[PDB]
Symmetry: D2
Subunit: 182 residues, 4 copies
C-alpha cells in the first residue's frame, strides 16, 4: 500500500498534462482559422457570383493552417499519433471537406487524398511522418455530399437550374462511391 | 433500518415493470408495421413507376396501425402520457414522416399536423385524449426534408430532370418554413 | 407548401421557450441552495465534531428550498409534471440524499419517502399535487449508501473505529433492502 | 468525380475490416477467461475461508490469458497500438483489478505496475513492445478501491471486524494516493 507508487506517477501525469495542453492550443488555432474559411464559403448559397472570391479566400486560409499542422506535428512524440489523434480528427475532417468543396467549385471533380495531404503538408502514410488518415479523408468527403445536397437546392432557389442538375449527378457518384464500401 | 419500506416498493416496481412491458409489446408491433411500410416506400428511388403501388401499401399500413395506437391509448393511465412517451416518440415520428412522404408523392403539398392525427386516430390536443405532439410533428417533417433530398438526387440518376427540379422547390420552401422557427 | 402552419408554430415554440426557461431559473436556485448545503456537509469527513453544526445548516437550506419548490409547483401546468420533470429530477435526488444523510447522522435510522416529502412540501402521490416520485427517492438513497461508504472509511482515518463499524452495519442493511428489489 | 478513387479504398477498407476482426476475436477470449476469474473472486464476500481457493483460481486464469495477450500482440501491426487499443483497454483494466485484489488478499500491499505487466507478460514501456499503459493501471487500481469498499462492508456482515478495519486503512491510502493527482 505505498503512496510511493503514486508518487512517481506525479511526474508522468504531470507531463502528459502539459503535452495534451500544447496540443490543445495549436489544435485550437487551426479550429479558428478553419472556421473563418467555412463561414465565407457559406455565401455560395446566396450569391452565385461570389464563388471565385470565396474559393480564393478558403484557399488562403488552408495554406495558413498548413503551417500550424507543421507546429502540431512536432509536438506529437514518436509513434503516438493515435494516442492524441482525437484532438485533431474533427478539425482535419472539416478541412478535407473545405478543400474538397473548393476543388469541386473550381474544377468539378473530387480531390484525391494525396492532394488534400499535399495542400495541407502532411504525409500519405503512417510511416514517413505525421499523416492524413484514410478514414478522415473518407469522412470529410462524406460531409461534402451533405453540403452539396444543400447547394443543389439553393441553386434552384437562385434559378441556376443547370448547375443544380450537375451537382446532383456528382452527389450520385459519391453515393455509388460509398456503397462500394458500406 | 427497516426492510419493509423495501417490501412495499417491490410491489410497485413490479407493477411498473408490467405497464412498461405491455407498452413495449404494442409499440414493437407498430415498430414492425411501419418498417414494412417504409421498406416498400424504398422503391421510389429506383423505379419511379412503382410510386402508386408503394403509396397504396403505405396507406394500408398507416391505417392498420391507427388501430394499434388504440390499444396503446388504453394502456397509458391518467395523465401520464409523458412518463412513457419515450417508448413511442421515435416510432410516431417515423409515421408522421411516412404519411408526409405519402401525401407529397400524391398531391405535392405538405400535410398539416391536423390530418396526420386524423389518419392515425390521435387527438390534436392533450386534453381530449392520447395525442400527437407538435414537436414530434416537426421532426417527422425534418426527416421528410432529408428523405426528399435523396429522392431529388436519384431522380437525376433515373433521368427525370423535370421532377428533380420540383422536389428542390419544395425542399426549398420547407427550409424557409424552418428558418422562421430558429 | 404553406408558410403559415409555420407561423402558428413559432407562437407555440415561443411560449414553450418561456415555460422551459422560467422552470430553469427556479431550479438554478434550488440547484444553488443545495450545493451549499452539501458543501458544508463535507466537513463530516475531516472533523467529526462539526456534525451537529453541519446538520443544522443543512436542515436550514432544505427548508429554505421547500419554499422554492412552491414557486416551482405553480409553473408546471395541468398534468404535465413528466414533460418537464427532467429539469428537477437530479436536483431532487440530491436533496433526498442530503436529508437522508442528515437524519442518519442525527438518529441513525433511514428516513421514509413520506418524510422527505413533508420536509420539502411535496405530496406523496401524483393526484394531490406536485409530488415526489418513488424512483427519485430510491436513487437518493442509493447515493447515500455511496456517501456512507466514504465516511465509513474516513472514520477509520480519524480513528473512530467504533463508529466506522456502525456505518457498515447500516450500509449492510441498505444492501439487503436493495437486493430485495433487483 | 471518380469511382476510381473509391475503388482502391475497397482493398484497405476490406483489410482493416479483417484486422479488427481477428483482434476482436482474441480480445473476446480474454474477456471470457477474465470473467470466470471475476466470478469466483466474488465468494470472498460470503465465505471467508474460500480466499485461498479463489486466489489460486484467479491466479491460474491470469496465466491462461497471459498467453492470449501473446497472440494479440502479434496481430497489432507496427506502432499502431493506440489505433486499436480501444478493443482491449477495458479488459486490461479488469485484469489489473483482478491481479491487484489477488495480491491484496494474499499479502496486503498494492501491486506495482511492473508486476502486473510481468504476470501478464507485457512491457513497461511503449518502446520495447506491446505494453501496459499507466492510465489503464491507474484505472484498474481505481476499481480496486471500489470493490474493497464493498468487501470492507461484508466483512462486518460476516463478523470479521478486525479485517474490515484493515481494509478501510488501505482504502484510505489509495484515496490519499489519488489526490496526489486529481
Amino acid at each position: 500500500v505505498n503512496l510511493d507508487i503514486f508518487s512517481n506517477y506525479q511526474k508522468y501525469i504531470d507531463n502528459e498534462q502539459e503535452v495534451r495542453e500544447n496540443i490543445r492550443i495549436v489544435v485550437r488555432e487551426i479550429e479558428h482559422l478553419s472556421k473563418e474559411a467555412q463561414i465565407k464559403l457559406q455565401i455560395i448559397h446566396s450569391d452565385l457570383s461570389q464563388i471565385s472570391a470565396a474559393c480564393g479566400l478558403a484557399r488562403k486560409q488552408v495554406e495558413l493552417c498548413a503551417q500550424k499542422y507543421q507546429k502540431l506535428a512536432e509536438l506529437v512524440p514518436a509513434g503516438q499519433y493515435y494516442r492524441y489523434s482525437d484532438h485533431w480528427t474533427f478539425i482535419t475532417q472539416r478541412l478535407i471537406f473545405i478543400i474538397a468543396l473548393v476543388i469541386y467549385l473550381e474544377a468539378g471533380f473530387l480531390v484525391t487524398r494525396e492532394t488534400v495531404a499535399e495542400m495541407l503538408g502532411l504525409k500519405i502514410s503512417q510511416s514517413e511522418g505525421f499523416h492524413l488518415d484514410v478514414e478522415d479523408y473518407l469522412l470529410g468527403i462524406l460531409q461534402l455530399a451533405s453540403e452539396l445536397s444543400r447547394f443543389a437546392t439553393n441553386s434552384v432557389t437562385m434559378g441556376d437550374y443547370e448547375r443544380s442538375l450537375n451537382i446532383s449527378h456528382f452527389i450520385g457518384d459519391l453515393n455509388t462511391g460509398f456503397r462500394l464500401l458500406n
